[PDB]
UniProtKB/Swiss-Prot annotation, chains A, B, C, D, E, F, G, H, I, J:
Entry keyword annotation includes Methyltransferase: no
Record's protein name: Proteasome subunit beta
HAMAP family: Proteasome_B_A
Protein's organism: Thermoplasma acidophilum (strain ATCC 25905 / DSM 1728 / JCM 9062 / NBRC 15155 / AMRC-C165)
Disulfide bonds: none
Outcome of mutating T1S: No effect on catalytic activity
Active site per UniProt: T1
Length: 202, 202, 202, 202, 202, 202, 202, 202, 202, 202
């Protein structure tokens, strides 16, 4: 599993791969690991599939109820704090997951949450077995002045490198871009393939 | 145990073998592993017999009550989600089962569910100790343009190969075909034997 | 790791992939797992790299000395028996390897040898984590009447299927053909790529 | 694995199946478990393949050297005693095998030898995971007045029953008949198939 | 312990032995392992004596209350399903028993139930440490066209063979015959002894 | 296993049963547990068959060589002392056996030897899993004034009681009588059967 | 500890010894192990003293309340069934006891109950570490035609033999005789001593 | 620890950092991990310091003696094979090291050797806890057409990224360039600092 | 992690670094470990991030509610006592944290609280893996007569030394000064950088 | 235990404390941990007293023999290499020690050697349980331009700080100064006390 989320001037970019390893072999090639949980919020999942899918359903319900009652979207840091409390309350019988939460309330935010409920905000983060390979690419190439198009190419290259070295990662890359003007937009598969061909990664 | 489920243009095909290994020997040669749980839904079971049989009874009750209350059949993805919640709620005292759910609501669907409640949709899937042999046959021979007759021959060949290499699998092959026009139809035993003789697998 | 060896009327075909998993990641993409150990004999290796490489050097030395002293090539069954004795003598501090030996002395032969020194002759065999996927392809498609060209396509398809489902397998496929008329011939990489394109496996 | 040996008035009949379970699946369907070790002596093997094959080679060498030095064949009880000493000398690092030795010196004999070197003579015996099913057939149907033809049918039925209930057993049945007049004679495969069809076991 | 149950055209035959091994010796020679639990239903027990006896009392109470309330006898498959639920509900603190249930509702039925609640219907079944010896006799001699008298002789021979090879089994054989015309009939001891003498088993 | 040895005025009586439990079932019904190791000396064995048979061969060789060199039979206490040294020298890798040695040099003697080399002389002794049942019979019925005929009946009754309560014991009873006048005499099987019928033990 | 109970034509005889081993030495020489729990019912105890004494008090209360409410004494089999339920309900936190229950309702009965609640009726039974020695005496000497006086001598001899071979048993023997005509009668100590002197057991 | 070695058209570049973690803290900031072992050969070390330093001394002695005896430098693959044998001979009491060997004999070579003696040639490789971060940089930026100057900048960036994410890595970067024309040349520290300032890594 | 708190005549100074080690690498470089929990109270955290963040939220809620109800700020020792009770109440399922609490009520105070609820007041204290290096600096250089400016330089030097020797510590240093006149004041980052340059620590 | 060694322009300074903790209490207050092993070489010891004292005797013998044979003092790096080989040769049954070696051959040197034989040269080093406190003092106060007098005061302050925080350290401080002009000079105790009083450390 390889997930990544980065922040730009007025945008958040999140991306994952699709390989699922069930019973010690590659049983599924097109799993879903990137989800929209609010109007301007997304989340990626890594770890136990069952625990992660339950948490995604919980967050969608909590955020939708929050929006209907208080008439506004929950702030991104409040989303991370809610997840932090939920995971820490069962720390001794925990969800075996690694989570990334990103979105726009008044500025871009990306949060990393561990199984014990620790939440840390960062300019970029990566989770899964392929994360160390992603961090190598981001350390040498990430720039805070990048445009959205340059940021999309950056995450594609980082995940492509992880797939070359992590056997638990593979499949098509899913990319989502979150902005205030356009909201949560998942890039089409053909556009991702076009960028891969232009970058010479196939 | 060997179970398999595939999707076609307008059909779902599921098939299992019948061998049951109780007390470390072959005690039963004609066990039942393929069940109809709704008008257009079927399910296969692998793992502990006691846990699997209880889950089959639960799903039949839930789906029938759902149909009577809401006047329509439960969607296939909703069936998988319900099973996902049930298994995950007892993950630390879990049902030691592997499940496949397939059916037609508006399009063919096949779902794979593990003991921890992880549910992944796929074009085809296989469970049990004989599954890796089935995946080899499906990887080299499956086609999305296959007809129903060609699909039935495909699953028969895949299970036959598994029986040749997995000692935990054996017995007669049971095959079911699910379509909107004809509903859940379990193929007669004589028809299966005729296809086996035509394919030269005996 | 995925290795395979098959016998035909007057030929032996052996093939492997190249992925090496050192320190729990994909460190090497072009490892060597298929070796020529005599004029008409080849061997594939699976398991611990260090143990396997030492055994390859031992077999090359033993077979070359055997040829120089007795003026003839060692029979294939004698090669397997020699390996069987070597592995069994250290069974409690064993080489953690799986071996296939194939060649021509008066007829095609393929032998499978385990870490405890058990040697069994078979018409075809496969070793490594990807072997069960190969056995599924071979069970449904292998024929004793196949030509050499058909046999080469068969092993390529079988290994390609294994690479799609076994994360420990990957990389370019190496194929060798052994005949009395032509000896040990390793197929060129471009020819393998041409067959892959013709089979629609890329 | 299923092996059996019985004694008659002037004959010894030994029979095995051929299935070999290497790496927890059925890797070989035509393994060899019945061996001729002297002019009027045979042996069956069950357990670890590597240990069993080494012992077969040792016994062939010891018995042939014994015949050349003392000009006569080693008595059957002496063969069992030699094996008993060899296994007991390494009882704490033992051969993980179960052995049957049968032959004619002046009268029929069948010996059962365990991994610790215990040797017991009996009118009939069976080894392997399928042995308890064989003992059920022999207890109800064996007779000391049976002819050679009746004895061959008896062992075929006993092994056939074991194959129906023991997943570790399978494949073609090999049968050998030992008499003073004709020596060690392994029955042809076609003759075994004819008896199977006549007995209605296929 | 050795229990067996078989089905015929219009009859069910169940039989057990009587040896009870309490404190690692033969403390009781005339234990009871075959019980009538309904008008046309019987049950055999194997495993822990305390757990088995409690279950027998529970089943007698449940079936008698069922008959009084719904005015008809519980169907045999319903009896097995009720036992399946009871055992599975305590699977992690289970009854350490093996159960056979047989009877007539509209046709003969025999069910095998394990400690985890798995229930499988079969034409014949056997439980206890002596079961593999029984399966050998049944595999070679059982016929679906047998008469009641022939079936009684069959189960007597099968249990007699088990007593010759299983030290945990012994004592007098108890046999019950269930038919629609005559109900649950336990054969007298003298009749069993007469059949044993006629079969030459003493 | 049940062995017994008693002393009288001018005689030693030793007796065993024949059941051998190999692989957790009754594999052999006619094992040999009573051996003549010298002109006026016998020995019984209990425990691991392989260890016991090796010790019997060692004692026969040592005693025969002793007789040829020193021209007289080894005294019974000297036989026990030799066994005591042999077993104690390997106490941390011991023979897992229980031994009884009895004979006549100038007076009757019976010695009990354990796996650690402890040797104790006694008027009577019993070894094996059935020994406590034998001791009950001997405590209530043994008399030092008994004749040889009365002593033979005593050991037959004691072993018969053990067979009724110890599942590891069974089969025909072998009895040997040692006297100075007649030497080592093994009673014929028909004579044992006659005594059993006269005692009402069948 | 040594307890015994036997049945005769119209009587039940129960007997125990008195030695109690607390803190790994003989702390008490005159413990009580035989109790009257009803007008025609007795019980013996073996195992943990604390658990056994609590059960004796429970049974006295239950049986006395039963007699007052239903105006008749509880049947002996009903007493055993009540104990069976009580012990089985706490099988995973059990009473570490072995129990014998004997008495007269319409015929003599003796029941043996283990710690898991298994209850088996038998003509005679014995519990405790000295039981195997008692079974040896009973197997060779018990007769169903014995008188009460002969039965009392039988149990005295059996317990005396156990005291000679079991270090955990010792002390004075307590004997009770239960008949319909005379009820529960505990024999006086002087009468027991007189029988011991007459039998030559001191 | 972070080590890296890459191959170019006519050059080999190897580089390490200097941090040593002794007793769970940073005790040494200027450790030595890159060594010249021959005229055109270098080696990097990772793992246990004591084991690594001993191996470096062994290799220097072996290669110098080899050069003096055979008058030529040992080929790079021969160096790796010698190390492979040394490590595998003690695999059960192994050197806990990870090694890279690079040099020029007729063409550039880089070999990776593990603790068990497995040796694999590759175009580039990295060892130590910081290796996955290096592989991310190399996967996205390495080119086989790079010049020596571009290659030096590449390894500096890769190690700098590792130091930002691996707490076990740090300190000054040491770089060596091996060519046929100039031999083994270790770059001066000031030149490395100049490149770091030019790359904006400080 | 490195945290420090010191007391002066009329001030409290607390300082931390920012490195967070999640999944055994440096995932976050700008974590937050210093918090204001009241008008004149601060707290530092070390250990499990999830547990620490939950405790910070609890303390902010408790102290704010305390201020609103009792109209005054909670005394510093009362803050430590409240934390002491909370941690000790769950000592067997504890928060895996190390805490420092400092502030002004009528005089400077610094409290150290462990995971078991032990609270000790001290003139200065340090927590985390880098604490022993800080204590070395404080032991040799701390003075109770220091000014606020001198105290700020002292904590900067102490943390800088810890970062040079503790791999778990790193990043920018955050410093807060608490006085009655000015309240809780967190020093700006540029001011910290200016002091670092003036002290020659970069 | 606290030991320290530093290098200056033309001098080496080594210092230790004297507390020895034998049987979990302070048994000795004046242990010796600083030794002269050559004309210009010293060594400090930490860890197991028995192992350390043996190594000191070995080094004195080796260095004195080296000086007599080769007529010159062994170089400091050669001393460390010799110790490195000795410790690594017994790494699996190692000396549980931490060692510092310092001296002058042509320039000052200080080497740190661990139990596995790893040797690293450094400008300064410290061993023992009090070492982290020393490193804090050295990081903030050590200067390469210090005079000998300033260096002596530095090590005294560093060890004094360690004694205030490490319970395993205590007692009088021993200091040695090594120069080419004056050789190995151990400072008198009164001079150390004078410096302690001047520094205000008492």
């Amino acid at each position: 599993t390889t997930t990544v989320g980065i922040t730009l001037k007025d945008a958040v970019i999140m991306a994952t791969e699709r390989r699922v390893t069930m019973e010690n072999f590659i049983m599924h090639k097109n799993g879903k690991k990137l989800f929209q949980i609010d109007t301007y919020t997304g989340m990626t999942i890594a770890g136990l599939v069952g625990d992660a899918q339950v948490l995604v359903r919980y967050m969608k319900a909590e955020l939708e109820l929050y929006r209907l009652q208080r008439r506004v979207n929950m702030p991104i840091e409040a989303v991370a704090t809610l997840l932090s409390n939920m995971l820490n309350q069962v720390k001794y019988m925990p969800y075996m997951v690694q989570l990334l939460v990103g979105g726009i309330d008044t500025a871009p935010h990306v949060f990393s949450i561990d199984a014990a409920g620790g939440s840390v905000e960062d300019i970029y983060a990566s989770t899964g077995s392929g994360s160390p390979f992603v961090y190598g690419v981001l350390e040498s190439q990430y720039s805070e002045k990048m445009t959205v198009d340059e940021g999309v190419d950056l995450v594609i290259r980082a995940i492509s490198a992880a797939k070359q070295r992590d056997s638990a990662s593979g499949g098509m890359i899913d990319v989502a871009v979150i902005t205030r003007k356009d909201g949560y937009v998942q890039l089409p598969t053909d556009q991702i393939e076009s960028r891969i061909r232009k970058l010479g990664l196939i």
